[PDB]
Amino acid sequence: MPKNYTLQNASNLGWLFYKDYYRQEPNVDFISTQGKESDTTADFFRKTNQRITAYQLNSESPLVAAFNNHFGTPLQLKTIYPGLITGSGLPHQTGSKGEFKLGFQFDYTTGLPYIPGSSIKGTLRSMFPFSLKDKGSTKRILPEYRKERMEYIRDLIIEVTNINEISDTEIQALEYAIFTNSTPSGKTIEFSLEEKDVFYDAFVADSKDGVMLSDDYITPHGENPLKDPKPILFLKIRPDVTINFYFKLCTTHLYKEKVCSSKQIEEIKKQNDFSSSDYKMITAHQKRNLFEKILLCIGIGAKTNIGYGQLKKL
Amino acid sequence: MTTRMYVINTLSNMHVGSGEVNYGVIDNLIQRDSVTNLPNINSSGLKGAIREYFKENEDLVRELFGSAPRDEKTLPGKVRFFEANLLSMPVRSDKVPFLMAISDEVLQELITKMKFFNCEEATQYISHLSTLLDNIKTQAQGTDFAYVFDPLLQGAIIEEVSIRATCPSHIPLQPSLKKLLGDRLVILSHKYFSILSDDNHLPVLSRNNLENGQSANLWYEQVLPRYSRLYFMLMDGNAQSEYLKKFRDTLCTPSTIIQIGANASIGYGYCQISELSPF
Amino acid sequence: MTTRMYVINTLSNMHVGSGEVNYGVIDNLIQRDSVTNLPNINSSGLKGAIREYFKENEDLVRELFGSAPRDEKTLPGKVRFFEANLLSMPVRSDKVPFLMAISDEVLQELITKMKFFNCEEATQYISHLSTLLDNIKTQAQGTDFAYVFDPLLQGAIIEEVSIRATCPSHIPLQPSLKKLLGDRLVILSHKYFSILSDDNHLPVLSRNNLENGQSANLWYEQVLPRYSRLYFMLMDGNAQSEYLKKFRDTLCTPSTIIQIGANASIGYGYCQISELSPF
Amino acid sequence: MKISKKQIEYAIEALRANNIITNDNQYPKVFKGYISSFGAAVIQSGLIPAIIFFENEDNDANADRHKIIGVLKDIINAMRQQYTVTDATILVSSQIPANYSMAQYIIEHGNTDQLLKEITEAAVAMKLALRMYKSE
Amino acid sequence: MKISKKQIEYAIEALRANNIITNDNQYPKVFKGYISSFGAAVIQSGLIPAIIFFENEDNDANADRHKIIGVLKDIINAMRQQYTVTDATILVSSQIPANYSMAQYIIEHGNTDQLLKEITEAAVAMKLALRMYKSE
Amino acid sequence: MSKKGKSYVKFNMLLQKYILKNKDMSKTQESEKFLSSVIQMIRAHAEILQIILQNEDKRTEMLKNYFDNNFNESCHLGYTGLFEDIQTLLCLRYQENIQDYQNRNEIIQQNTILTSDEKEILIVSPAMDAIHTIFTALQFIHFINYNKDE
């Protein structure tokens, strides 16, 4: 109920948004057709919304400090005015008045709004050329998809690394090593324990002088310009909220358009055939900067084509 | 000999799957113990995860875990890994973000296991846990209950309106028991805990396979909530002293995080192993 | 010269392999008794496990178990072991985490074996078990039944065989029989127990061999559920008294945990052995 | 959770009656996603809120999602038609009335435990029945 | 339970006939695990749900799993060509039609006991037969 | 064994290859336990071997694959390529047995004068005889190689 979301006194935001949202209070009707647009239902949902959108997150929160301890140094980014929407496809719609129509991604235990690591991984892989599966339904669009994403990823790799020129096959190998951790044919590479790219969850870390959740309106004006539009209400992460992106990245060694482990490159370097031109490496910091530039270019979440989920460097 | 109890604190969500042998409303369901029907980590998975962590040290893995597959000199393992059973689970509330939930049957199971296996610090823990269980049973008098030991947590909702918390003032919770079981501890009857940990109440995470921004597959995954605690037993089994010392020191170091389960690349199932502290 | 009955309390899961003589859908199946088809332990396995435990004491092993296979001087075994037959198995329920399941046929087999072998405290147990069986058959009188002897356990659902447990109040269960058969006891018809101990209803655990994160082999293993009870007879035929006393004292000590079966390093088959207490 | 053959038969009949499975034995693709989303919503929001989600037909942007609730009600009614006469966990004073809204039925009868069990079983059975037949 | 030589020969014929081993005498390594998974599913979920789950192919259910049920169908058909009358025993022998899916047949007149026996023997025979080819 | 064919030659070379000319002074004899395992798995899987043999076109590759799948790391010391020689000898023995005994067995079964016992004595199964010949050859190799008697 108060501000300053803490483990001591704060309702679970996911619980409040999913289970306590639709509590069966006496004299509230959202099952019948008449009750859904009744004003009592609107007031009930409005009070629940007010409770949801009234919490703050201190920069020195013990929760985020524990996250930093467990998952390493964060990548701190902030949100631009439209906001950040994630998990919009989760079902949270009854057709009642004053209710949040779209779903929202909350952590089960903590309740803090978060971006699951799968969302981050998929958003990063989408800009990589070999994300679309060659399955037959995508035969037509695969070539142009691969070409444009290959060009963009080549620009980003050249900009962020010290590699002067990288090939399409090397781009394929790098993408498969980073995400699938294998060769493009599915063959496993003999990687060590710490040579794996882990995309942790992204957590809200700091809402400086305001709440971290807010309500926004999307109003689709109909095809008919004479009928009234239908407003849509949903929950967004507020502008100027610090999102912490946690990664566990490694160093990728490329030799002759192939991805090799640390030991394989250690043995290959000693051999009296080691071509320096045919050797490329991307450190963890360079990979993190590549991911950071991808995020700053395309953003993360839902409704991204209309400006939502756009991130800025802190 | 020298059996010890280790506690698994899940830093993130856990998915240890049972395969497609189970069909529920959720596509992917987690492993459950065949007796108590509670979420558990099989001893094989635990041994595999710890072996994967220690793989760099070849002598330690060979002496302790045994020969790797496809090794000419097959060699048995010296240490014995026991199944990881659920100790405490986080439950969502309105007074607090989450509470650590344990059941009276889980406590009885823990007491029985400590009595049978003779853990290192089992004596005082057995004494105080038996005392706590007896006090809990005396207060309940054969009824459903939800007992909290912090007076500010009165009237709290435990994941559901029908499960409301009460505080019996004169039942004490020892600081060491609080450390082992978790802060904001609520002790539930068997019915309440079986309702909270059943397939319908365990958290579900959704995943979507996208093809050029269009949905291809949509499946939902059952996960064990983060910060959940599990316990397992380790038997030395006449192993070399220095290798065991290194193993214990590495496993119990706060900097050590172990990955157990599926979806490692997206951050599922990172845990910390801790030893049973002296009471 | 004296036959004593011992009870095997299983602290973990049991897998004693049949070994491809019995093919099935599951790759690895457990040992089942030749006549009753219930899970059992071959006496060779019991002797091997106990000899493995006592391997440190060469004199005791030589006098009681026999000579090592490689020894040139052949010495026969003096203590005669017998196969461990299933007594009670855990079944899942709703009111309690699990129930201790026994059947009328298992009880009749126990009575018959006690009559045939003349255990040390056989007389009292035979009398009281016969009273219990006659009372149960008088109550059920030809129908399928499931009787619990704790009033609180009334109405418990057996999940695998969806039947509710009814409590006949006029059938008393003696405390010594409760110690033998196990707490939270349900006595069922033969058909219900056969379904519960069937291959289609026993626990199956999935095991996967990962080769750099990818599955190399996959197989399924049948396991006897944790806390299951098995009984066996021990004949001290023509053995030295001091070695027999040391063997009985060590075996029945609560600190003695025996591993019987496969998958020792992942905590399968760890048991505790207790003797038939006086009534 | 083991589903009987009769439950799957009931699911097939209910799918046929609610005009999900066409005459030529084919069903629209989005219905399996609807079933999975219903299960997830039941886990995530509760039985009553999930049924209210899937009974609301005002979306008009997805397919016709209200048919799944009709299939669930038909399966539940068929299951209740053959409950044994023990009257402990039966609660079948009658079937669910056809024109009743299922959410109101759940509100009126506070036996959320039994209704939750039947709804979960019916949803699993309908998932299996859809898996029997062919998508687009 | 004991497998006869004839069932293993039927398994070889069905494995070759249902396009599981290529002309190079290799089978994809996933199929042994698929057989084991089918056995475990039959045990844990039941004959009918396991058959339904393993027979579907509309989604990306590995696009090869329904071949296992095809091989099981071929083996059961072959075993029911012979041992037909045998009036002294309690078994019903018939030819399961090609157009009828196995799930449909067991739904209609499975009887769930002769079918359980035939399914387990067919699965064991499949494992033994695959022991004589090599993984890709 | 018939000496008018390649099976006798293969038998002689198989014996000459894996017979130790000098006594091995090793207290363990790992190779002999490998040989005992091979012997046991030949005598246990005799029916599956018969099924493999009765197939005509693809029996050789099926034999090789079956031995590959049943034996893991089937080369420790000494016996190297023993499986290839064993499979070749087994196929040659089966072909010779088919040439010799098949029509004879068919005619024997059709003779009404002979009783069941005499017919069973006279009938020789080709695949079983080939497997038995391999088993006897392996037992001879084990007998010569193993230091421990009895």
User: Which residue in this structure is represented by tokens 């090869």?
Assistant: E64
CB B186 within 8 A of CB B106: no
The answer to whether residue B207 neighbours chain D at the CB level (below 8 Å) is no
- Spell out which residues of chain A touch residue D37, defining contact as CB-CB under 8 Å: 91
Query: Under 8 Å CB-to-CB from B102, ≥6 apart: which residues?
Result: B87, B88, B89, B181, B185, B186, B187, B188, B193
| C-alpha of B245 from chain center | 24
Q: F30, E97, A13, B81: which is closest to C264 by C-alpha?
A: B81
Q: By C-alpha distance, which of B182, B172, B23 is closest to B87?
A: B182
CA angle E68, E69, E75 (to 5 degrees): 90
Work out the minimum CA distance from F47 to partner chain E, whole angstroms. Answer: 7
Instruction: Locate D93 and state its tokens.
Output: 């004073």
Q: Which of D35, D42, D45, D57 to mutate to test the interface with A (most CBs of A within 10 A)?
A: D45
Report yes or no: D124 and B25 within 8 Å, Cβ to Cβ. yes
Residue B147, phi then psi, degrees to nearest 5: -105, 130
- CB-CB contact of B99 with B89 (8 Å): no
Residue positions counted in chain B: 279
d(CA F143, CA F139): 6
Asked if B64 and B244 touch (Cβ cutoff 8 Å), the reply is yes
**Backbone dihedral angles phi then psi of residue A311, each to the nearest 5 degrees:** -110, 150
List the chains bordering chain B where 3 or more Cβ pairs fall under 8 Å. Answer: A, C, D, E, F
| Coil, strand or helix at A53 | coil
Chain A touching partners, 3 or more CB pairs below 8 A: B, C, D
Question: Which residue, among C279, C278, C277, has the nearest Cα to C6 in the 3D structure?
Answer: C277
Sign of CA dihedral B178, B179, B183, B187: negative
Give residue C192's identity as a one-letter amino acid code: Y
Collapsing DSSP states into helix, strand and coil, what is residue A231? Answer: coil
Q: Output the CA–CA distances (angstroms, integers) from residue D6 to D11, D133, E115, in the order listed.
A: 9, 17, 17
Count Cβ atoms below 10 Å from residue A87 Cβ, excluding itself: 22
Chain B residue with CA closest to F76: the answer is B72
CA distances for C229 relative to B112, C10, C11, C181, E110, angstroms? 16, 6, 10, 8, 37
∠ CA A220-A224-A225, rounded to 5°? 75
> C interface mutation test: which of A188, A195, A196 has the most C CBs within 10 A?
A188
| Beta strand extents in B57-125 (DSSP E only) | 80-81, 84-92, 98-103
What is the Cα–Cα distance from D45 to D42, expressed in whole angstroms? Answer: 6
Q: A184 and chain B: CB distance < 8 Å anywhere?
A: no
Which helix (H) or strand (E) covers residue C50, if one does? Answer: helix C43-54
Question: Which DSSP helix (H) or strand (E) runs through A261?
Answer: none
Structure's resolution in angstroms: 3.0
Region for E111 from its dihedrals, namely left if φ exceeds 0, alpha if ψ lies in -120 to 50, beta otherwise: left
- For residues B75 and B94, is the Cβ–Cβ distance under 8 A? no
Helices (H), chain E: 5-17, 30-44, 47-55, 66-81, 102-109, 114-130
Handedness of CA C190, C196, C200, C205 (dihedral sign): negative
β B98-103/B185-188 pair status: parallel
Total residue count of chain C as it appears in this document: 279
The SS3 assignment for A295 reads helix
Show the tokens assigned to A77. 């980014």
D49–A22 CB contact, under 8 Å: yes
Q: Are A89 and A135 in contact (CB under 8 A)?
A: no
Query: E81: exposed, middle or buried (C-beta count within 10 Å: 0-12, 13-18, 19+)?
Result: exposed
Beta bridge partners of A280: A254
Scanning chain F, the segments in alpha helix (DSSP H) are 6-17, 30-44, 46-54, 59-70, 82-109, 116-122, 126-145
Phi and psi at residue C230, to the nearest 5°: -130, 145
Within an 8 Å CB–CB cutoff, is residue A109 touching chain B? yes
Q: Assign F28 to helix, strand or coil.
A: coil
Assess A11–B contact: CB distance below 8 Å, yes or no.
yes
User: With an 8 Å Cβ cutoff, is F28 touching chain B?
Assistant: no
Residues with Cβ within 8 Å of E70's Cβ and at least 6 positions away in sequence, in order, are E14, E18
Nearest chain D CA: its distance from E116 CA (Å): 14
Q: How many DSSP H helices and E strands does chain C contain?
A: 7, 14
Minimum distance, in Å, between the CA of residue C213 and any CA atom of chain A: 8
d(CA A158, CA A164): 6
Q: What are phi and psi of A208, to 5 degrees?
A: -60, -65
Interface test with chain B among C266, C268, C274, by most B beta carbons within 10 Å: C266
Taking the C-alpha atoms of residue A74 and residue A77, their distance in angstroms, rounded to an integer, is 9
The nearest CA of chain E is from the CA of D45 a distance in Å of 27
Residues in chain B with CB shorter than 8 Å from the CB of A10 are 96-97
C271 → chain B, closest CA residue: B116
Q: Count of CB contacts below 8 A, A vs C?
A: 10
A233 and A215 in contact (C-beta within 8 Å)?
yes
Which chains reach chain D with 3 or more Cβ–Cβ distances below 8 angstroms? A, B, E
| B161 contacts on A by Cβ (under 8 Å) | 23
Amino acid occupying residue B169: S
What is the 3 state secondary structure string of chain D? Answer: CCCCHHHHHHHHHHHHHCCCCCCCCECCCHHHHHHHHHHHHHHHHCHHHHHHHHHCCCCCCCCCCCHHHHHHHHHHHHHHHCCCCCCCCCCCCCCCCCCCCHHHHHHHCCCHHHHHHHHHHHHHHHHHHHHHCECC
C-alpha to C-alpha distances, C85 to C2, C19, C81, nearest whole angstrom: 20, 19, 12
- Count the alpha carbons within 13 Å of D73 in the hemisphere toward its beta carbon: 23
What CA–CA distance (Å, rounded) separates B272 from B251? 8
Contact B158, B146 (CB under 8 A): yes
Which residues, in sequence order, are CB contacts of B109 under 8 Å at separation 6+?
B36, B85, C97
Rounded CA-CA distance E50/E43 in Å is 9
Contact between chains at E49 and B23 (C-beta distance less than 8 A): yes
Question: Residue B269: which region, alpha, beta or left (left: phi > 0; alpha: psi -120 to 50)?
Answer: left
Residues 6+ apart with CB under 8 A from E59: B217, D135
The answer to whether residue E30 neighbours chain B at the CB level (below 8 Å) is no
Subunits next to F (3 or more Cβ pairs <8 Å) are B, E
CA-nearest of C3, C247, C1 to C120 is C3
Residue C70, classified by CB atoms within 10 Å of its CB into exposed (0-12), middle (13-18) or buried (19+), is: exposed
Burial class, E55, CB count within 10 angstroms (exposed 0-12 / middle 13-18 / buried 19+): buried
CA-CA distance, B228 to B106, in Å (whole number)?
Answer: 14
Rg from Cα positions in chain F: 17
Instruction: Say if CB A301 and CB A85 are below 8 A apart.
Output: yes
Mutate which: A7, A8, A11, A12, vs B, most B CBs within 10 A:
A12
Q: Which residues are CB-neighbours of B3 under 8 A, at least 6 positions away?
A: B117, B118, B119, B120, B233, B234, B235, B236
Q: What is the largest CA-CA distance in chain A?
A: 84
Residue ranges of B 219-258 with Cβ closer than 8 A to chain D: 219-220
| Residue that the structure tokens 């789950």 belong to | E53
Q: What is the C-alpha separation between A246 and A74, in angstroms, rounded? A: 5
DSSP designation for A180: I
Minimal Cβ distance to A22: which of D45, D59, D104: D45
What distance in Å separates the CA atoms of residue B109 and residue E42, rounded to the nearest whole number?
31
**Of C99, C93, C53, C88, nearest to C250 (Cα)?**
C53
φ, ψ (nearest 5 deg) of residue B249:
-65, -40
Task: Note whether E107 contacts D134, CB cutoff 8 Å.
Answer: no
CA A13 to chain centre: 19
Chain D neighbors of E53, CB-CB under 8 A? 128, 131
- Angle of helix D112-132 relative to helix E47-55, nearest 10 degrees, comes to 50
- Collapsing DSSP to helix, strand or coil, B80 comes out as strand
E133 near E26, Cβ under 8 Å?
A: yes
Q: Is there an interface between F and D (3+ Cβ pairs < 8 A)?
A: no
Task: Write out the E strands in chain A.
Answer: 75-79, 114-115, 198-199, 202-207, 213-218, 232-237, 241-245, 247-248, 252-255, 258-260, 279-282, 311-313
CB of B21 less than 8 A from some CB of C: yes
Intra-chain end-to-end CA distance of chain E, in Å? 30
Q: How many residues does chain E have?
A: 136
Sign of CA dihedral A285, A291, A297, A301: negative
Consecutive H or E run containing B135: helix B122-140
Buried residues in A120-137 as b, exposed as e (16+ CB within 10 A):
bbbbbbebbbbbbeeeee
Neighbours of chain E (3+ CB pairs under 8 A): B, C, D, F
What b/e string do you get for F137-150 counting C-beta neighbours within 10 Å, with b at 16 or more? bbeebeeebbeeee
- Helix B104-117 with B122-140: angle, nearest 10 deg: 150
**Residue B112 to chain D, least CA–CA distance (Å):** 29
Radius of gyration of chain C (CA): 20
Question: What residues of B are in contact with residue A20 (Cβ under 8 Å)?
Answer: 94, 157
Chains D and E, touching by 3 or more CB pairs within 8 angstroms: yes
**Chain F, nearest residue to B72 by Cα:** F73
